[PDB]
Structures are given as C-alpha cells and as structure tokens.
Amino acid sequence: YNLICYFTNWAQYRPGLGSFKPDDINPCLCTHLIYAFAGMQNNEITTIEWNDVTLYKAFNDLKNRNSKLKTLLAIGGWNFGTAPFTTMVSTSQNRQTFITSVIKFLRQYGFDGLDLDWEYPGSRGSPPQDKHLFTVLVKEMREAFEQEAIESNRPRLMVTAAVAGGISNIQAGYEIPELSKYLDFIHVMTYDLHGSWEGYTGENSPLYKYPTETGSNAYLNVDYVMNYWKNNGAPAEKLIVGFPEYGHTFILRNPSDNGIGAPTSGDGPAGPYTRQAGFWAYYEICTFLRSGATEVWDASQEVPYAYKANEWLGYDNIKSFSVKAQWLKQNNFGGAMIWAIDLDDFTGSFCDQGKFPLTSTLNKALGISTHHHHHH
C-alpha cells in the first residue's frame, strides 16, 4: 500500500507551534510526499510563494534520508480555480508548452512527478469540452513522461490527479475509463462531504451513509464515492482514498439540537493557528476536546463528532482512521492520501498521542516499512 502525504506551502505562515516547513516532516512516515501548490503563467508551471525554491530543496532533500521516498508537485487547488487550466488545455500548442515546462521544472527542482489538482474540469466555470480535454492533457503528459524517461535513462516521472468526490462534479469532469489508463494514481478527495454550506451538521469524511439519508445525500460517504470510481472504470489498485487530518466546524442554530443533521447558522470560529473559519486542524481539535466538549461516536458512519454549547465539529480521529484503513485494504485499494500532514499533531504537544498521531496510525495500519533487519 501507498501512503501519500500532502504538504502545503502556506502552513509556514501559521503562528507559533503551527508553523510547518518540510524539515518538520518525518521522512519515514509516508511513501510519497506531494507539494501543494504550484501555479501557472503563460501556460507554464511556476512557483507561487516567495521561498518556494528554498522549500522545494528542503522537501526533496527528505529523500536523502529515505531511499524509497518519492515526491510530487501538485498544481492548482481550490483557490486557483479553473480559468488557467481551461486556457492551457484548449489547444495542442498550449498543452505542449505546459508539458514541456513541467518536465523541465520537475527535473530542475528534484520532483518525481506531477499531481494535477484541477478543481474541476467541467465545473466552477470550466466549459463542458474540458472533460475530454482533461483526458487529452493526461494522455499527452503520460506519453511525454514515458519518452523522457527513456531518453534520459531515468525512472519515469509519475502523473497523478486529485479528483472530485462529489458525484455531480465527477460526472461533469472525468472520462474515468480512459483517464484511468494514463494516470499512475487517482487521489480521490473523499472529504469535505458535509460542511456548513449545507445549513446543517454533517461529517467531513463518513465511511458509510447515515441511515436516514435519501437521494443524492446518500452519495456523501467514502464507501459510495470510492466504489463509484471503481465501478465506472478505475482499477482499485490505482485508487487512493482521501483521509482528512482536519474537521469542519458549525454554529448550531439551537444548542439542544446537536446531532447529525442539526440545523446550523454558519461556520464555527477560526482556529488560532489555521485562522480560517469553517475548519480546524487535528491539533486544534484536540484543544477543543480538552475545553469542555462532548464527544460522540457516529456509529453508523464510523467517525466522531463533538460539540460544546453552540459549536459543533465533524472530524476524524485515530479510531476512524483505523477503521477506514482496514476498509480500504479489504477493498484492495492502492492506499491512502492525507490532506494534510501539516494539520496533524506534528509536534505532539496538543493531543498527547505522540508525534504525527493520525499519519502514524495509517503508517502502521498500511504496513509502511523500509527498514528490514534480517533478525528478530
């Protein structure tokens, strides 16, 4: 199994103990590290942060401490939107400009592959023809990577993609059978399945449907989404399950109504380190759980929630990560990906569960290991 760990290049700006840079990563925990995010200018890949070159070197230097580790660079993300991708895929000239720039960029800075994170082809302003043009981009990039590997006598650069977990976005965005032939791995974003945008409480990454969910609401769980990909053309071995190391917050419209589906008024307050209303990192959640919160196990969905007065949290913990790791192995998927390693309790100071409790849970559950001693 693979354990793919996203690192974000804005985590460095979090105050105090929240600040996270590549040297904070334990190089032995994951099999792959993905750097989020690169950008695009004139149809060529580019940096986005003033010190990305510094962080790239620290990131890829981690491989000097773990000879099995591979790294990838992710391009796009939510805030990046779709317009640059649409323009870039619109013509063969623009796709060639981009692919050529990626090969040079990844080889220059020491990456082993590119993770495409277009959110999403066919949606958020992207026109309908981008569903097929995304397939064409991926096909041409895989082919260019295969040729560069042979021409440079190096292992081939990987091409992966982070893909939607919402059924409407999946249907609008991806030609799953053909896309699956050319991608090395498919990182399915099985999180953000509920959130304050819906006007009621729900879990971020429930494994199973809630018993009274009907219609499209019954799609909003890891089981349905992973099996949708699997049964519409993607090989299980290429499918990677998304694991969030954060939770979503809500303000309850009525504190006594604090179950799944309780009505809500909006996002919960920003955390002191992540400073974005609507979510908390796992280490921030641990502080919340020590501040008087009530913890509840959502038994049907195999995830926890918690609440305190008018604040409600749907999240993941060691137990839910363990249950879902067991599940993905039984279903023969390729492994797990984590959004994001800088949201774990990387210092060990917040949760009293050791360093990197959630990521370590998956490392153990998936049997990640590179140090063999040849004796008891």
Ligand SMILES: CC(=O)N[C@@H]1[C@@H](O)[C@H](O[C@@H]2O[C@H](CO)[C@@H](O[C@@H]3O[C@H](CO)[C@@H](O)[C@H](O)[C@H]3NC(C)=O)[C@H](O)[C@H]2NC(C)=O)[C@@H](CO)O[C@H]1O
């Ligand atoms: C408004 C909203 O919640 N939209 C959801 C998108 O966030 C999500 O996109 C992917 O998931 C993660 C986690 O949500 C995204 O991380 C966000 O990245 C932006 C920069 O682009 C940063 O400003 C946010 O702080 C950060 N949020 C968190 C909790 O870390 C990430 O960009 C996207 N890529 C990956 C691999 O996860 C999509 C997933 O389908 O759902 C929307 O509902």
